[PDB]
Amino acid sequence: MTNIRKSHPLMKIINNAFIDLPAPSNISSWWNFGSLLGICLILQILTGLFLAMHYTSDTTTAFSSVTHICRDVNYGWVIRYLHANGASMFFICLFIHVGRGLYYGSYMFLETWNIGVVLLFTVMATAFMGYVLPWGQMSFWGATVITNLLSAIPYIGTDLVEWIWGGFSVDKATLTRFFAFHFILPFIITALAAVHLLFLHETGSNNPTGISSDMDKIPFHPYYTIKDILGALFMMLILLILVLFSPDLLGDPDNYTPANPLNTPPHIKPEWYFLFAYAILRSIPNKLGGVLALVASILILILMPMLHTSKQRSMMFRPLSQCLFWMLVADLITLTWIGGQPVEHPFIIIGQLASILYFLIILVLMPITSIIENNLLKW
Amino acid sequence: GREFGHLTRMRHVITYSLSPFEQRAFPHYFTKGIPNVLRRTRACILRVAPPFVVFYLVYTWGTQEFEKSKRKNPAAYEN
Amino acid sequence: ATYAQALQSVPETQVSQLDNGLRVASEQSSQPTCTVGVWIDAGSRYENEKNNGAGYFVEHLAFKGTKNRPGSALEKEVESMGAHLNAYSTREHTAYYIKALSKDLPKAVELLADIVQNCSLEDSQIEKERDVILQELQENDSSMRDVVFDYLHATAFQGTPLAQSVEGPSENVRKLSRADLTEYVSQHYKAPRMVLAAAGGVEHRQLLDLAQKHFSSLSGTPCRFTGSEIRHRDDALPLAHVAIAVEGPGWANPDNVPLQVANAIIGHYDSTYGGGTHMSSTLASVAATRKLCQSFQTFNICYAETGLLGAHFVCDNMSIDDMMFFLQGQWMRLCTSATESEVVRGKNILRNALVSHLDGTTPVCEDIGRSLLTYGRRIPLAEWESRIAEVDASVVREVCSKYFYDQCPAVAGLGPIEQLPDYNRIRSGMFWLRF
Amino acid sequence: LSRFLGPRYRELARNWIPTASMWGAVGAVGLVWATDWRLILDWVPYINGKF
Amino acid sequence: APTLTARLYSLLFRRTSTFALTIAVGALFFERAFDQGADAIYEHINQGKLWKHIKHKYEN
Amino acid sequence: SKWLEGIRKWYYNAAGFNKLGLMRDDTIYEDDDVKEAIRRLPENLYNDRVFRIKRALDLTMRQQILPKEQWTKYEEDKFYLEPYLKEVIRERKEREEWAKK
Ligand code: HEM
Ligand code: HEM
Question: Which residues line ligand 1 (CB under 6 A)?
Answer without folding.
Answer: A 41, 44-45, 48-49, 51-52, 55, 66, 69, 80, 83-84, 87, 90, 123, 126-127, 130-131, 133-134, 182-183, 186, 189
